[PDB]
Amino acid sequence: SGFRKMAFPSGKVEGCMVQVTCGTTTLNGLWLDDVVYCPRHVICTSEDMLNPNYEDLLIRKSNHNFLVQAGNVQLRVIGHSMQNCVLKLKVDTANPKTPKYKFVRIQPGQTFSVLACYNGSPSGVYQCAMRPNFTIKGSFLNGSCGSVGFNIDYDCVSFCYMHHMELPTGVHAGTDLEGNFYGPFVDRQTAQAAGTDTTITVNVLAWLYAAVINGDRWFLNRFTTTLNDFNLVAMKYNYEPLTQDHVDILGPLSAQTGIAVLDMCASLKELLQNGMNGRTILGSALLEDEFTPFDVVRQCSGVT
Amino acid sequence: SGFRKMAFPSGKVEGCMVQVTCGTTTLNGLWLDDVVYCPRHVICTSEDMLNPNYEDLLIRKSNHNFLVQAGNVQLRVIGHSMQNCVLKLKVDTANPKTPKYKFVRIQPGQTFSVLACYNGSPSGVYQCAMRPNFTIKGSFLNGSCGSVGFNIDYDCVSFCYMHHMELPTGVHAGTDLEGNFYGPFVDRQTAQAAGTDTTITVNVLAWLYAAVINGDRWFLNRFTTTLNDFNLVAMKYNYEPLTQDHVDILGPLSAQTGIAVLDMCASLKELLQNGMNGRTILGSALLEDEFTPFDVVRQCSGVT
Numbered sequence: 123s124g125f126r127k128m129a130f131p132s133g134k135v136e137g138c139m140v141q142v143t144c145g146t147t148t149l150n151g152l153w154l155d156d157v158v159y160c161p162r163h164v165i166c167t168s169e170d171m172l173n174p175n176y177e178d179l180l181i182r183k184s185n186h187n188f189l190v191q192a193g194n195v196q197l198r199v200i201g202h203s204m205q206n207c208v209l210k211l212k213v214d215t216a217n218p219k220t221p222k223y224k225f226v227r228i229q230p231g232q233t234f235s236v237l238a239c240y241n242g243s244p245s246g247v248y249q250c251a252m253r254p255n256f257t258i259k260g261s262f263l264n265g266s267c268g269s270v271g272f273n274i275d276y277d278c279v280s281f282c283y284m285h286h287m288e289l290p291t292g293v294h295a296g297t298d299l300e301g302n303f304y305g306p307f308v309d310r311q312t313a314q315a316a317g318t319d320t321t322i323t324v325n326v327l328a329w330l331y332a333a334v335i336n337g338d339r340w341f342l343n344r345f346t347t348t349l350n351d352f353n354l355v356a357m358k359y360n361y362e363p364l365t366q367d368h369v370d371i372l373g374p375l376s377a378q379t380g381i382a383v384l385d386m387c388a389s390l391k392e393l394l395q396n397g398m399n400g401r402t403i404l405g406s407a408l409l410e411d412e413f414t415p416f417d418v419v420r421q422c423s424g425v426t
Numbered sequence: 427s428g429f430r431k432m433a434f435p436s437g438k439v440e441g442c443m444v445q446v447t448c449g450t451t452t453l454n455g456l457w458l459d460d461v462v463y464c465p466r467h468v469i470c471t472s473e474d475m476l477n478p479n480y481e482d483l484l485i486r487k488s489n490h491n492f493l494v495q496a497g498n499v500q501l502r503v504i505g506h507s508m509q510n511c512v513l514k515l516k517v518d519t520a521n522p523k524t525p526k527y528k529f530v531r532i533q534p535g536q537t538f539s540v541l542a543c544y545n546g547s548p549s550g551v552y553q554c555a556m557r558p559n560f561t562i563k564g565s566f567l568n569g570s571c572g573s574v575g576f577n578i579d580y581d582c583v584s585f586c587y588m589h590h591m592e593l594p595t596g597v598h599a600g601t602d603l604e605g606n607f608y609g610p611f612v613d614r615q616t617a618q619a620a621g622t623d624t625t626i627t628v629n630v631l632a633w634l635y636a637a638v639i640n641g642d643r644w645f646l647n648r649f650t651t652t653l654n655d656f657n658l659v660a661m662k663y664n665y666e667p668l669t670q671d672h673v674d675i676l677g678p679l680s681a682q683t684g685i686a687v688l689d690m691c692a693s694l695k696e697l698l699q700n701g702m703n704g705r706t707i708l709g710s711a712l713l714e715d716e717f718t719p720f721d722v723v724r725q726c727s728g729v730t
C-alpha cells in the first residue's frame with residue numbers, strides 16, 4: 123500500500139565519501155579501491171573559473187597539494203591524473219568499505235539516487251531523474267560538488283553521476299564517473315542555457331500504472347488511442363514521443379493490471395487535454411515523471 | 427539551489443536491520459546493543475490476528491523459537507520479553523554496527539525518514555510525516571513490518587517509528603520504539619478508521635519560505651492577516667490551527683527572508699481561497715506539508 127519517491131539505501135555510498143581539498147577549495151570525493159574521484163574544478167580559484175586551462179592549472183599541482191580526508195583520517199596521495207572533467211587521486215590505501223561497483227553513463231529519463239554531501243559528510247538522500255535536456259533538478263549548495271548519483275542492484279552500486287555545477291537557472295549539471303558531462307555543459311563559469319525540459323512520457327505512464335495498483339483509478343476512461351495519435355498530443359504538451367520500445371518496457375505493468383498500454387495512453391491524453399480538475403493521483407496534483415517502469419515494478423514488488 | 431524531499435542517509439540504520447522469524451512469520455527487527463526490537467505480531471498466525479491474546483500466545487514461545495538472522499549469520503537468543511506492542515529479544519552478541527541512538531516519541535506534524543525493509547534487507551529510504559490523525563502515508567508491502575522511522579542529529583540516530591500495519595484504507599500505523607502505537611490503533615486485524623487527516627499548517631508555511639529562498643515567489647502578495655483571521659481560513663480548509671508557538675518556530679525563516687510570518691500567512695490564505703491557477707511551487711501543484719521548519723533550515727543551510 124502507498125507509493126513514494128524512494129531512494130536507494132545510501133550506506134554503501136556513505137562509506138565511499140571523503141573530503142578533498144586543493145589550495146583553498148574543498149569539495150567531495152568518491153573513494154573506491156585505491157582511487158579518489160572528484161571534480162577537476164577542485165584545482166581552481168574563483169578567479170580561474172571564468173576561463174580555466176585545466177591542463178596548465180594542474181601542472182602547478184603535485185600529489186602533496188591534494189588533501190584527502192576520510193572521516194577523521196588523512197589519505198596519502200601517491201598519484202594524480204585528469205580523465206575528462208574528473209581528477210583521479212591514487213591513494214596508498216584501498217577503501218575497506220568499497221562496495222561491489224560499476225561506472226555507468228545513464229540515458230535521459232533514467233532515475234537515480236543522490237547522496238548530497240558537504241566536506242565529505244553525507245547530509246541527505248533523494249531520488250531524481252536525468253532530464254531530457256541533461257540537467258538534474260537536485261538540491262545542492264556550495265560544497266556539494268563531488269556528491270554522487272547511483273543505482274543499486276542487490277549488492278552492486280552503479281555510479282552514474284558526479285555533481286559539478288549549478289546553472290544560472292538553479293538546475294544542476296554534472297558528469298558520469300569517467301568525467302564526461304551529461305549534455306553540452308562545460309566546467310566553466312559561463313552562462314549556459316539548459317534546453318527544453320520535456321516530460322518523460324514512459325515514466326508518467328509507469329506512474330499511472332503505479333496509481334492503479336495502489337487504488338487511484340478515477341482517471342481510467344472508456345477510450346483508447348494509437349501511438350501516432352498519442353504522439354500528436356505528446357508533441358503539443360512537450361512530452362517525449364512514445365516509441366514501441368517504451369510500450370514494451372511497460373509490458374509487465376500492463377500484464378499485472380490488465381490495462382493495455384494504449385488504453386493507459388488514452389487516459390494520459392485526456393489528463394493532458396483536460397487537466398486533473400482539482401483532483402490528485404498518488405498525492406500529486408501534477409503528472410509525475412521521475413519514476414521509471416523498473417522503479418514502479420521494484421517498489422510495487424519489494425525488491426531489496 | 428533546488429529543494430527536494432530529502433531523507434537522512436540510511437547507513438547507520440541499515441547496519442541495525444535483521445530478519446526475525448517466529449514459526450511461519452518473518453518480519454524485520456532492529457538490533458541495537460544486545461537487543462533485537464520487533465513487532466509482537468511476529469508470534470501470530472493469520473488465524474490469531476483476528477482477536478489475539480498476545481500474553482497467551484507468547485507463553486507458547488521460547489527463546490529458541492525466535493530465529494534472528496543478521497545478514498547471513500544467526501544470532502543466539504538468550505531472553506525475550508514483551509513491552510507494549512513490541513518484543514525485545516535479548517541476544518548474546520552486541521551489534522558492532524550499533525550507532526549512537528535514542529528512542530523518541532514524535533508529535534504529529536514531525537517528519538522522519540523510513541528505511542523500508544523486507545527479510546531484514548533494506549529496499550529503500552523515503553521521507554514522511556506523522557499525520558495529525560497518527561497515521562503515516564508510507565510505501566509498505568507484506569514483510570515490511572518492523573521497518574523503522576528515524577531522524578539523525580550529527581552522529582546520533584533518534585528512532586521514532588516501527589511499522590506494524592496497514593489500515594484498510596492503505597495508510598500506515600505503527601508504534602514508537604517502546605511499543606506504544608501512535609494514535610488509537612491496535613495490533614489486531616479489525617477495521618479501524620483513521621480520523622480526519624488535516625494539513626500541517628506550520629509545515630506548509632515553512633515550505634513557502636523554502637520556495638521564496640529558492641526563487642519561487644509568484645505567490646507573495648500585498649496583504650497581511652492576523653492569527654485569528656488566518657485560523658478562520660485554516661478551519662474552513664481542514665488546516666491545523668496556527669499558534670504563536672508555530673510563529674516562533676518560523677522565526678529563523680522569517681529572519682532569513684525578511685518576510686513576516688503573518689505576511690506569509692496572508693499568501694497562504696490567498697492560495698487556499700484561490701488555488702494555484704495552474705501554477706506550481708517547488709515542482710508541486712499542491713501545498714506541501716511534509717517539510718518542518720527545521721527541515722527547511724537544515725536543507726537550505728547544508729547540515730551534515
Ligand SMILES: Cc1ccncc1NC(=O)Cc1cc(Cl)cc(NS(N)(=O)=O)c1
Nearest residue numbers: 163262263264287288290309310311312
Ligand atoms: C554554488 C553551488 C550550488 C550547487 N551546486 C554547485 C555549486 N557550485 C558551483 O556551481 C560552482 C561552479 C562550478 C562551475 Cl564548473 C561553474 C560554475 N558556474 S556558475 N554557476 O554559472 O557560476 C560554478
Ligand SMILES: Cc1ccncc1NC(=O)Cc1cc(Cl)cc(NS(N)(=O)=O)c1
Nearest residue numbers: 467566567568591592594613614615616
Ligand atoms: C500487508 C501489509 C502491507 C503494509 N504494511 C503491513 C502489512 N501487513 C499487515 O498490515 C499485517 C497486519 C497486522 C496487523 Cl497488527 C493488523 C492487520 N489488519 S488489516 N490490515 O486490516 O488486515 C494486518
